[PDB]
From a paper:
The model contained six glycerol molecules, including one in each active site, and 192 water molecules. Crystallographic refinement resulted in a model to 1.96-Å resolution with an Rwork/Rfree of 9.0/11.6%, and other statistics listed in Table 3. The asymmetric unit contains a dimer of dimers. Therefore, the native arrangement of HNL1 is as the dimer like the modern hydroxynitrile lyases discussed here. The catalytic domain consists of residues 1–107 and 180–265 and contains the catalytic triad (Ser 80, His 235, and Asp 207) as well as the catalytic Lys 236. The overall structure of HNL1 is similar to that of modern hydroxynitrile lyases HbHNL, MeHNL, and BmHNL. The larger phenylalanines in HNL1 push the side chain of Trp128 out of the active site by 1.3 Å as compared to HbHNL (1 Å relative to MeHNL), thereby creating a larger substrate-binding region in HNL1. The active site volume of HNL1 (143 Å3) is larger than the active site volumes of HbHNL (94–119 Å3) and esterase SABP2 (123 Å3). In addition to a larger substrate-binding region in HNL1 as compared to HbHNL, this substrate-binding region is more dynamic in HNL1.
A reconstructed ancestral hydroxynitrile lyase, HNL1, from the α/β-hydrolase-fold superfamily is the focus of this paper. Most enzymes in the α/β-hydrolase-fold superfamily are esterases, which catalyze the hydrolysis of esters, but this superfamily also includes lyases, which catalyze the cleavage of hydroxynitriles and the corresponding reverse addition reaction. HNL1 primarily catalyzes the cleavage of hydroxynitriles, but can also catalyze promiscuous ester hydrolysis.
Author numbering:
A (entry chain A): 2 to 261
B (entry chain B): 2 to 260
Write the structure that this text describes.
């Protein structure tokens, strides 16, 4: 009946983006964990101390690590959260009943983990008022980004009520895609990430991931189930929280373990 | 009449708390500023790096200093934000058209700046699952606190939409009253803080500042005006956002100068 959902935010965001989905899922009896990834939300590290996508994803992987033996979770990742979900799946495929991508980057096993990032960066090249910066690890320069207010308003939170946008102004922080780290890491494997069930949730009104890109990702790495939500925007957990919850219910009804 | 409201959160919280009130005020034409104090919200410092009430308050004092000459603000402070308001008022009285205390601590000028914190701590001595810790700085011992989830749900966010409680759990951080530092500070001045207009907004359903403590505060240092909100809880900016906005529009009409 019920599942354990692990909700995973995108870059520049935090656990807080799930403030309205989480209690909605709890009403149905589900367990929900919403994590801050490294240097995200109220984690104390700044992004400039995080060197790799692996470090960035550490709170998810140590949560997965600690899951008692036999317990499984449905991972839910928005936007870049998709990447994290694949990393987690590649190390802990036995601990995952499914992974849901909601307006999310959905990597494959055939190409470099950067593949869908590189493709996204080519089809959405106008960041508006976003500010870009750099910092260094011992041997690499990493690009950081602080999302611009006008980008957020117009492209992310387009049909979210104004308070969500206000909240995002109050809480978003400097993040990174770790694109170059992604381009040089080992591909995700068929036995890890390639063995889990994948559900892909999207809307064609997303003003950041346009429909030909999302259609492209679906075709590139065919998921087990696709759900297209009408209207809304990039932040479906904000703009269409109830519908998203109803889809997550059905995903739990399919993939969650049954109890004796 | 419009105003420039400066909204000041309590300890363990941040600017985020104002996420529903800010846009509501803005719709009426007001300018709103909502700041993160030191080591709060997404400020990058941890509370264990902050030694004094002053240091804690620094982003509000900085913003007041920055205010172009002639401009005035209406300060609004929730809970322990009322102590920051008093510190600001004492340094920049002439920049303050009024100070609004929203179920807030409201210090005076006759007693030590800690006085209402000391009283509060006797009136509400059970903090449930709140975690208390100390840290060291210089030659002082300082108490940190991380609000318990149960204390927050039962006593702070009791009539708030469930999603606001959920935010709180995702965002609240370790904070401090800096009680010891307030006990040794010089008293607020009659000429500075004592000269500003103070509006006191409250509800008798607040489950952390109960009514006999709020009445004690109002009796101790009589405000210029009182508004009592029916229902709600300690977090009126989330539980009664619209009625708070309406009160603030009236405070603006009364206090905020004609150009």
């Amino acid at each position: 009946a019920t599942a354990h959902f692990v909700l995973i935010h995108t870059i520049c965001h935090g656990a807080w983006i799930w403030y309205k989905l989480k209690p909605l899922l709890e009403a149905a009896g589900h367990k929900v964990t919403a994590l801050d990834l490294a240097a995200s939300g109220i984690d104390p590290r700044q992004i400039e101390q995080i060197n790799t996508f692996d470090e960035y994803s550490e709170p998810l992987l140590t949560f997965m690590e600690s899951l008692p033996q036999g317990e499984k979770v449905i991972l839910v990742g928005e936007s870049c959260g998709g990447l994290n979900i694949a990393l987690a799946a590649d190390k802990y495929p036995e601990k995952i009943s499914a992974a849901v991508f909601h307006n999310a980057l959905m990597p494959d096993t055939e190409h470099s983990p950067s593949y869908v990032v590189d493709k996204f960066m080519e089809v959405f090249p106008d960041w508006k008022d976003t500010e870009f910066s750099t910092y260094t690890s011992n041997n690499e320069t990493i690009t950081g980004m602080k999302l611009g207010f006008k980008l957020m308003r117009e492209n992310l939170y387009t049909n979210c009520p104004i308070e969500d946008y206000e909240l995002a102004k109050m809480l978003t922080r400097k993040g990174s895609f770790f694109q170059n780290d992604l381009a040089q890491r080992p591909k995700f494997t068929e036995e890890g990430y390639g063995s889990i069930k994948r559900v892909y949730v999207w809307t064609d009104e997303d003003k950041i991931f346009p429909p030909e890109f999302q259609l492209w990702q679906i075709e590139n790495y065919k998921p087990d189930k696709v759900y297209r939500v009408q209207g809304g925007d990039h932040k479906l957990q904000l703009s269409k929280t109830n519908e998203l919850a109803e889809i997550l219910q059905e995903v739990a009804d399919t993939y969650a373990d049954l109890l004796a």
